Design a protein around this nucleic acid. Structure first.
Ligand SMILES: [Mg+2]
Ligand SMILES: [Mg+2]
Ligand SMILES: [Mg+2]
Lengths: 149, 177, 113, 132, 202
RNA sequence: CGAAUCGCCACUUCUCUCGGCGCCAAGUACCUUCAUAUUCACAAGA
RNA sequence: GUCAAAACUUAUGGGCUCACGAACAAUGGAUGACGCUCAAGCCCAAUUAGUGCCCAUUAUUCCUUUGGUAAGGGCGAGAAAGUGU
RNA sequence: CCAAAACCAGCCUCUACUGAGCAAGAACGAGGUCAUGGUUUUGGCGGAAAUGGGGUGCCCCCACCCGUCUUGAAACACGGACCAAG
């Protein structure tokens, strides 16, 4: 999706990793002035285009637009609050919670990733009745040979 | 990256004498890596122009100059440079950048590649910000339209360094390194 | 703890059976060893001198002192924690019986008792 | 008393054993010994089977998670102490106190289960990137 | 028993970057198994690279070509030579590492259905070539240089693909089960866990 | 014959342009064995 | 980039380049080799990024030796007025 | 004897001005370390153990045959099969 003023890029690899921010104004073809009132550290700055990943979001806006205009307009859409809603955003905050996590939270996760992986099988075993599975489907048909004997 | 070249304004004069009791002070904008080079390029012009030399003068101010702001704009840099292949090409290229310092350093890399021209061969002759229309050059004119949209086509998205990997499973992003 | 534990062998002793392993300083402009190219054998020098208070000290911790007869043992009576008598190779097994049951009575050490 | 034992390691904290017989075992740090001495982590053995025993602070990873076990009396842990009835009796008297101290906490059910946990550097796993 | 092999899938990787990264891992003890070396790319038109190879093939001992440089024409043998040129091939450390690499044209039935196939993102063609510049797929140039099995491999590659694809929808009912079984696992008794799964994105 | 190695899988192991699980109760309920193997020491175990 | 220590092929830097490109006619074959081409090339700048690293018989520091016709102090086993053991 | 941890010391690493910048100064905190010094502690091993040496092989790495005259020798320059006595 096209990069232009008002596009809502996601910074990738820099000091401001995950953070997003609207493309205030194009400079030339390899740079832009990113901005975003919602984060403390997304004061207007020159991101390289290599560094940003355009998002599907993009407020309508005019080049070299003043910042207070932006703390306005994005507020009237909540392009940001709308953005965090997406799995693409949650995945970024999700990995940003696991890396940020303490050891007991990782217990507190493994207990769930087993609590669920256990019930994934419990659901499946119940549903094992309906084929197929190597253990059940192979066997039901497998008996077909046994019945013939 | 932040500009290669800081914007210095070196001010200085030939030191006072009964020969010249109240010498002219000379302001001189420079684009230098650091003041010691800006001070140097300043004394280069003092002898190449005023016949005053570094031993006989005294810089009155090495100070760097504050950026105009940060909005993307448009710079007409006027850049004389030298080579054996060309002994003094006056040449006002225009560059699109956020600052005089950025347009100028951008003009050195541009000038160092299209011309195997080292920093000390080049001398900036001025760096006006230009309004949209005055830029005769067609390249940066493409970027003027308030409605300009372009794709970031065929990206190479390298991972954040912390996440980079040597081997990965093929339709996955499980690491294997 | 020694600087160098290896002998400083003569250059190319290994090719020539006649040459003793004992060191001779290399000469000849073109000697790889005296021109001290890095892959070559080393030459002895003042820098390989052993630490000077651990010098001459055998792993027993004693400095060896030659002994020939039972009277020599008293040369070590009062410094028996510093010197250790090494009985000369040529004293008889006869006499060594005498040096040894006396080097025992005196608390003096013997390297070859 | 003197103690340079680090701020991350405090009594009642959960603490991974990095070395020795009980690798990967989450273990509450019951107390530091009277001089800048090795910690006396305890399982409790009621959970992960770790006996009361000494461990050097260098050989555990003090997790941020802990338990307010100031209430527990670990006073019977003294250097002179360091399976006989006098000791089997000691932990029984302690683990039951230590184990209830774990119960008092909200989210005290996980910490019982959190101490049944065994740490393992599984492949692709990056502790240095970990926080604890 | 199988050793800890990792079967790099070399399709659409730059020849010499993949050969350089692989050649390093072999030194670090990885036991790699390159496959689809037919699919390695090289910068430039095939004509650029045929001429590079035919200048290679042009080199032989006049005294006795029999013992001369050997000009293997298999893309895989070409990748092994490329990867032995990047490791200490005369010390045993490197002579060893080179034998820890097993190149194949295509992906052979022993190596298929063995595990996931790795990839080298630093050696990806899209990562390296400027996309609109011409590029030489390797097994394509070497077909013109003497490799005789370029069509034997394509017939084989066609078979593993048509076969792997048949098994991909033989198992569609199965994968669909775990997808359904796992989604309804969230609805199960994992309550507090359902919030510890929401955080972290699960 | 004592060994070094230390994730598995027919949910990856097709193609072409967050794979699942495992990590100490077969499960989220901590029922419940672990000590003296006496604070590292090849995991004394696979 | 590998060989090769180091950018696990760093840059969240600029340009340029398609075919070569990387200080001082005849045995087949040499950017050192491979290979590289959004370079692993060239010019430029950089150092984690508009918020570096690697390698010396070098330097510094530590230990030891040796020399000083160098500077001082001293006179459980030792304490010698001593160039040199 | 091998280890490991600690302590102390050492050692090392990790405001000001200016118009957001510097040519700019420390602090707190923490880490590292004995191939640094002094303080033990704690375990492991104990006919054998242990450190050292020696021998043989390997591994990685380094490494042009010496003497010679010569500006220059690995030289496609000379002398050089082995050893003993001289
Ligand atoms: Mg073992
Ligand atoms: Mg390397
Ligand atoms: Mg001559």
């Amino acid at each position: 999706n096209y990069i232009r003023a008002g596009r809502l890029v996601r910074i990738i690899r820099g000091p401001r990793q995950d953070r997003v921010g609207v493309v205030v104004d194009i400079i030339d073809g390899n740079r832009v002035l990113v901005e975003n009132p919602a984060d403390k550290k997304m004061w207007r700055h020159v991101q390289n285009l290599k560094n940003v990943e355009p998002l599907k979001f993009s407020v309508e806006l005019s080049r070299n637009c003043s910042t207070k205009t932006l703390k306005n307009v994005l507020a009237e859409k909540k392009i940001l609050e709308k953005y965090a809603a997406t799995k693409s955003a949650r995945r970024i905050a999700a990995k940003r919670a696991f890396a940020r996590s303490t050891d007991f939270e990782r217990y507190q996760l493994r207990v769930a990733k087993r609590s669920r992986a256990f019930w994934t099988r419990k659901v499946f075993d119940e549903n094992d009745k309906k084929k197929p599975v190597s253990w059940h489907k192979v066997a039901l048909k497998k008996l077909q040979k046994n019945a013939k004997k | 990256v932040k500009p290669h070249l800081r914007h210095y304004c070196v001010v200085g004069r030939e030191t006072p004498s009964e020969k010249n009791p109240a010498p002219t002070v000379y302001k001189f904008e420079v684009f230098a890596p650091n003041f010691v080079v800006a001070k140097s390029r300043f004394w280069r012009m003092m002898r190449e122009k005023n016949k005053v030399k570094s031993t006989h003068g005294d810089v009155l101010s090495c100070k760097v100059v504050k950026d105009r702001k940060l909005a993307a704009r448009n710079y007409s840099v006027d850049i004389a440079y030298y080579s054996q292949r060309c002994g003094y090409t006056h040449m006002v290229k225009e560059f699109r950048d956020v600052s005089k310092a950025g347009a100028v350093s951008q003009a050195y890399h541009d000038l160092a590649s299209r011309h195997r021209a080292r920093y000390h061969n080049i001398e900036v002759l001025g760096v006006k910000s230009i309004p949209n229309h005055q830029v005769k050059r067609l390249s940066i004119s493409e970027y003027h339209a308030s409605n300009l949209s372009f794709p970031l086509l065929h990206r190479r998205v390298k991972a954040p360094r912390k996440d980079r990997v040597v081997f990965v499973k093929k339709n996955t992003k499980r690491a294997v390194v | 703890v020694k600087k160098r534990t290896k002998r400083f062998t003569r250059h190319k002793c290994e090719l020539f059976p006649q040459l003793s392993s004992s060191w001779r300083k290399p000469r000849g402009e073109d000697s790889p060893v005296r021109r001290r190219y890095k892959g070559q054998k080393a030459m002895p020098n003042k820098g390989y001198g052993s630490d000077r208070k651990t010098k001459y000290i055998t792993p027993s911790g004693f400095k060896n002192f030659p002994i020939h007869n039972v009277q020599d043992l008293y040369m070590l009576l009062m410094q028996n924690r510093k010197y250790a008598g090494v009985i000369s190779h040529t004293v008889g097994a006869k006499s060594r019986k005498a040096i040894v049951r006396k080097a025992h009575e005196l608390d003096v050490r013997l390297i070859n008792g | 008393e003197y103690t340079t034992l680090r701020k991350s390691c405090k009594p009642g904290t959960i603490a991974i054993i990095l070395a020795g017989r009980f690798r990967g075992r989450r273990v509450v740090i019951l107390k530091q010994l009277p001089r800048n001495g090795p910690l006396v982590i305890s399982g409790p053995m009621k959970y992960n089977g770790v006996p009361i025993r000494r461990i050097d602070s260098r050989y555990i990873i003090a997790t941020s998670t802990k338990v307010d076990i100031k209430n527990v009396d670990v006073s019977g842990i003294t250097p002179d102490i360091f399976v006989s009835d006098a000791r089997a009796q000691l932990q029984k008297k302690v683990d039951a106190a230590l184990i209830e101290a774990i119960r008092k906490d909200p989210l005290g059910k996980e910490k019982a289960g959190y101490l049944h946990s065994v740490f393992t550097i599984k492949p692709g796993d990056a502790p240095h990137r970990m926080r604890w | 028993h199988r050793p800890e092999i990792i079967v790099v899938d070399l399709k659409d990787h730059v020849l010499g970057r993949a050969a350089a990264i692989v050649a390093k891992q072999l030194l670090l003890g990885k036991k790699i198994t390159a496959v689809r070396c037919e699919q390695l790319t090289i910068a430039g038109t095939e004509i650029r690279n045929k001429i590079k190879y035919l200048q290679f093939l042009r080199k032989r001992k006049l005294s006795n070509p029999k013992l001369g440089p050997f000009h293997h024409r298999s893309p895989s043998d070409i990748f092994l030579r490329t990867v032995r040129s990047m490791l200490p091939r005369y010390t045993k450390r490197g002579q060893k590492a080179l034998r820890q690499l097993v190149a194949y044209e295509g992906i052979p039935t022993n190596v298929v259905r063995t595990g996931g196939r790795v990839v080298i993102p630093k050696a990806q063609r899209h990562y390296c070539y400027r996309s609109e510049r011409p590029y030489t797929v390797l097994g394509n140039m070497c077909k013109h240089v003497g490799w005789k099995y370029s069509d034997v491999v394509k017939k084989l590659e066609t078979a593993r693909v048509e076969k792997a694809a048949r098994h991909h929808k033989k198992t569609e009912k199965l994968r669909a089960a775990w997808k359904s079984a796992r989604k309804e696992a969230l609805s199960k008794v994992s309550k507090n866990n359902l919030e510890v799964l929401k955080k972290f994105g699960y």
